[PDB]
Amino acid sequence: EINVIIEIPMNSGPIKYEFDKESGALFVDRFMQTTMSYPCNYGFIPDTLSNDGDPVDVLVVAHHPVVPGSVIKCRAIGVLMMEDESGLDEKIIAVPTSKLDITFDHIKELDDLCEMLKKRIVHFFEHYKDLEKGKWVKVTGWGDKVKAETLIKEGIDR
Amino acid sequence: IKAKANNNEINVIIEIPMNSGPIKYEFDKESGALFVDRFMQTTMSYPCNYGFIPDTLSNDGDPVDVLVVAHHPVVPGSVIKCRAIGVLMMEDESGLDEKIIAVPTSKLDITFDHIKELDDLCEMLKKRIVHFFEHYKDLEKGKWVKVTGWGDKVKAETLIKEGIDRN
Amino acid sequence: IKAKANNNEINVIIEIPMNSGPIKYEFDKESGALFVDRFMQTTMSYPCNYGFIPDTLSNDGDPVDVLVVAHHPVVPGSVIKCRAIGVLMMEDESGLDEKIIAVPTSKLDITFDHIKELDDLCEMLKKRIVHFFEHYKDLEKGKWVKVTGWGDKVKAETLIKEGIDR
Amino acid sequence: NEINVIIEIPMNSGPIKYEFDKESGALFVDRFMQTTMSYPCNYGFIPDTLSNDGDPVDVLVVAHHPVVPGSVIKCRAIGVLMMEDESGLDEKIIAVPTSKLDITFDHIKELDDLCEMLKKRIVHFFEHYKDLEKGKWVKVTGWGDKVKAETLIKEGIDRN
Amino acid sequence: FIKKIKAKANNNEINVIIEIPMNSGPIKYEFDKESGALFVDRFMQTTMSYPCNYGFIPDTLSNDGDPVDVLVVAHHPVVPGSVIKCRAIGVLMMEDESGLDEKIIAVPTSKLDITFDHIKELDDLCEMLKKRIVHFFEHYKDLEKGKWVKVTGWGDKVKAETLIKEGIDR
Amino acid sequence: KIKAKANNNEINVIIEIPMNSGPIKYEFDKESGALFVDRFMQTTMSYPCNYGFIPDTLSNDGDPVDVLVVAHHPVVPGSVIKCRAIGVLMMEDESGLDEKIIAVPTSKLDITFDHIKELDDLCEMLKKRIVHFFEHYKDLEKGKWVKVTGWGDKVKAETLIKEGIDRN
Numbered sequence: 001e002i003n004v005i006i007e008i009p010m011n012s013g014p015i016k017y018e019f020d021k022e023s024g025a026l027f028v029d030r031f032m033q034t035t036m037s038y039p040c041n042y043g044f045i046p047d048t049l050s051n052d053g054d055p056v057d058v059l060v061v062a063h064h065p066v067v068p069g070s071v072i073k074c075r076a077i078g079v080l081m082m083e084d085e086s087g088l089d090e091k092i093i094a095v096p097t098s099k100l101d102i103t104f105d106h107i108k109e110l111d112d113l114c115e116m117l118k119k120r121i122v123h124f125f126e127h128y129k130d131l132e133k134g135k136w137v138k139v140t141g142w143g144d145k146v147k148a149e150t151l152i153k154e155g156i157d158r
Numbered sequence: 159i160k161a162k163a164n165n166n167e168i169n170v171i172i173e174i175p176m177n178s179g180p181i182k183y184e185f186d187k188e189s190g191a192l193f194v195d196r197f198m199q200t201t202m203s204y205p206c207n208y209g210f211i212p213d214t215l216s217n218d219g220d221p222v223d224v225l226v227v228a229h230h231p232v233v234p235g236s237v238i239k240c241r242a243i244g245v246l247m248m249e250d251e252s253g254l255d256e257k258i259i260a261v262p263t264s265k266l267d268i269t270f271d272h273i274k275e276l277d278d279l280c281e282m283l284k285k286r287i288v289h290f291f292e293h294y295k296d297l298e299k300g301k302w303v304k305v306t307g308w309g310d311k312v313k314a315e316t317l318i319k320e321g322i323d324r325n
Numbered sequence: 326i327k328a329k330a331n332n333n334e335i336n337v338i339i340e341i342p343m344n345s346g347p348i349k350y351e352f353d354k355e356s357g358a359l360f361v362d363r364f365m366q367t368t369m370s371y372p373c374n375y376g377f378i379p380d381t382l383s384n385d386g387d388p389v390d391v392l393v394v395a396h397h398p399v400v401p402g403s404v405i406k407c408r409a410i411g412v413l414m415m416e417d418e419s420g421l422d423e424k425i426i427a428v429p430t431s432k433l434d435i436t437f438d439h440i441k442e443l444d445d446l447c448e449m450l451k452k453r454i455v456h457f458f459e460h461y462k463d464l465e466k467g468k469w470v471k472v473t474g475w476g477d478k479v480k481a482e483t484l485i486k487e488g489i490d491r
Numbered sequence: 492n493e494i495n496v497i498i499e500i501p502m503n504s505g506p507i508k509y510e511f512d513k514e515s516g517a518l519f520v521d522r523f524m525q526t527t528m529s530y531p532c533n534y535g536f537i538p539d540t541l542s543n544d545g546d547p548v549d550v551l552v553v554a555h556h557p558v559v560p561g562s563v564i565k566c567r568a569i570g571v572l573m574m575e576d577e578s579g580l581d582e583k584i585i586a587v588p589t590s591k592l593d594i595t596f597d598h599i600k601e602l603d604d605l606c607e608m609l610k611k612r613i614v615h616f617f618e619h620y621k622d623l624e625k626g627k628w629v630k631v632t633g634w635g636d637k638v639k640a641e642t643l644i645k646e647g648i649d650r651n
Numbered sequence: 652f653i654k655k656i657k658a659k660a661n662n663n664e665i666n667v668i669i670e671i672p673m674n675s676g677p678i679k680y681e682f683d684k685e686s687g688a689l690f691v692d693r694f695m696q697t698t699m700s701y702p703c704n705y706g707f708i709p710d711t712l713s714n715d716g717d718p719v720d721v722l723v724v725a726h727h728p729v730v731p732g733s734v735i736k737c738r739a740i741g742v743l744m745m746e747d748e749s750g751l752d753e754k755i756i757a758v759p760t761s762k763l764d765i766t767f768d769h770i771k772e773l774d775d776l777c778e779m780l781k782k783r784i785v786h787f788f789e790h791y792k793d794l795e796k797g798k799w800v801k802v803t804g805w806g807d808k809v810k811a812e813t814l815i816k817e818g819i820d821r
Numbered sequence: 822k823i824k825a826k827a828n829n830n831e832i833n834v835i836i837e838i839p840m841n842s843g844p845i846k847y848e849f850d851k852e853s854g855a856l857f858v859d860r861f862m863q864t865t866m867s868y869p870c871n872y873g874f875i876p877d878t879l880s881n882d883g884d885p886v887d888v889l890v891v892a893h894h895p896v897v898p899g900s901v902i903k904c905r906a907i908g909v910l911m912m913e914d915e916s917g918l919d920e921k922i923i924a925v926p927t928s929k930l931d932i933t934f935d936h937i938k939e940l941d942d943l944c945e946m947l948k949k950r951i952v953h954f955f956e957h958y959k960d961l962e963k964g965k966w967v968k969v970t971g972w973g974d975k976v977k978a979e980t981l982i983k984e985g986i987d988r989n
Contacts, residue, residue, distance in 0.1 A: 503865070525950060526953055527867050527868070527950055528864070528865045529867070530865070612865060615864050615961060616864070623949050623950065
């Protein structure tokens, strides 16, 4: 079980929020220029640090959006691997715990996710900065659960 | 935030907005974080803005909770200054449960001015409320709720006092 | 509009979108006007898109109605091409009522392709639908509903062939 | 004594001012409203009626919730709102849903039965919603009786 | 109603029947001009929504037997089935898998929204909005197998009115 | 405690009330840092812009300098927009004098405001809509009135902000 603070709710529209850690305020990072909304609730695991000096970020697949700033207890089921202009980028894929939503209980690996959801997610990431000057993403592959858990542990320990 | 404002008004912190669908939020009393308690499974949403009175303590070990009857939803984590007008009494699988029923103060909304007692609320609204609590956990294993009655304004004020004094 | 879209597909005109609040709409066959039936008094919303099959006739004189399981709501009056996968069987105060359960054809949403019967639906969702039907009329006097069970696809195809044949 | 009202503009909806084309039966965008105001009530008209201005009799339907544009609410008139604008007198029936549709309005028999604040909010909307249209304005002169509304209704059905 | 509505609201102006609102969800609606029924064409599979209000001019026939299409650039979404009177300012030009496709770019008439009065040619539209429209059309079929779209370029107002006239005369 | 200025001409603005957001009039309580419901507003009017204030500022009314952020979309309450001041909306109510800074997002947030550097660059109807809002949003609150007395320019705005920063 990991705690994930949500920055950006699924299907929310053009606003790209980001938490300032120095203050804990939610800042507007960007007013997004495409017609794309985030495919998943999106946030981070508090008290963790990626090698990029930032927290471990997370896509929480849920059936519903959630107010920015709310926390979802989830479990990691995988990892989405990307490289952006700032280099390499990994995002955990997680789902609510069976206390929050029992209907995800049979979802144990990426394998168990809708294929189309997964493609929607790649398509989103590969395109949502297209109209952002000086910015881009490439999706190089996926990791499994064991891979997700090691990322988290390394990020807690860092 | 204190349990009470002026003129015997209470501060109530909103966890869940009225008619707001399936997310059941709850504030972590420790860290002050807004947590997702559940993604609720029925097709019901709360009939009221729902929250708690800060700086209070129930026998259950949590803040006195409150249903705010209002004409409009409010973002979660926002604070409505209200007057208590009653109590909803329940029993669930784990014991007794009471919820204050409050309305906004006339300074937030003058249209509630003439609502001083429970008998002043919409009759359907009151049944909507009981219906909500008696059924919204039906798809949750082992959970039940039964409304056993209502208390009056004094009853509420006493509950609130005890909650304050108990902190 | 014809009831049938292909061999094993139906047209369904949506009156009430999934998760859409208190408004309960019903189309007036005569006028073809969409009327407000009631403002519902519980905190329940439709657990999915709900409508009927144009050009069909139930044993009750009304058309054959369907709950269309979908990923999203649809505007009332709009028409979804589906395939029947089952049926929900109920009784209310006015006796028997059954509803076809359907999913969008795979042309409209391929994520539904692998759902061919009721048992391929989310168990919670099925539980959600029943719970709704069993309680959404609770605060309306002299009104009630009990779910007596489900029928399978064959059973649904037969209710549709009937209502067309009638 | 019950009326069918086809709704053009749902309470609290954005800026889109819809207008029924009687010719075609289509829903036209009359205006993208320039102010920050939203309709205070669901608004439309009674089919197969006909007012002095040669337009259908139009109705504000006080309800607790919005309805999609084009849908029809069975209602019963309780009063009339009387106005004049840059073009003369305008009057609007105030109706509430039948008790079949919403039993919570059962006790609403006259205008006096309405929230004073709703009545005020209505007046203000009308007096102000066209402020940013050049040359246009509205002033509310007063309110009519339920018999005034029925009369009005009677007259629009007959005029038709 | 699709039959009772004229294609031109007068000399400047076209009646456009909206099928899909701006910034609307995944639902891709299409009027069937047989029955005038609104059909769900598809539940779109990407995270994209339409960047403007989308519909067609009644009483027109494109070369391909459909009506003439219009993206109505507007400040706000309208309800599907509703009609807006606009005036054309351009056309967008592309190629999908099934050949050529041009769509008319229009704005409301100044009677509907006077804030559009100074918008006369494409050059007057926000550049980011134009890029956003292109982007949309180039990508919103990406998850639909065998489906593709390239944007060829833009036509001017004269091109647009030529398109309208033709479709009318056709 | 968020900085007033994100840098030498940009300001941080904490949003209380989203554009087009309905009847809820929120107000942050400084002492608690809690988002309070101030009013359930009684007319059918919504805010024309995202509205809030600059932290760490203090006006003469003993409240922080408050801002209308013209933007294409509402943003959640409590969220912070980085912007740049382009003018001042100058008014009087029953309490006396009042000024609201008019800001737009920085070009990092939204490049489409890039070309908007003075009030005359704004849609005239938008400006008409903002004035109308303020001059009527309180008509149904007894005793309350507002008169828009005019507009200030960027220099003016930028002075107000400077003073509000120095005064805090």
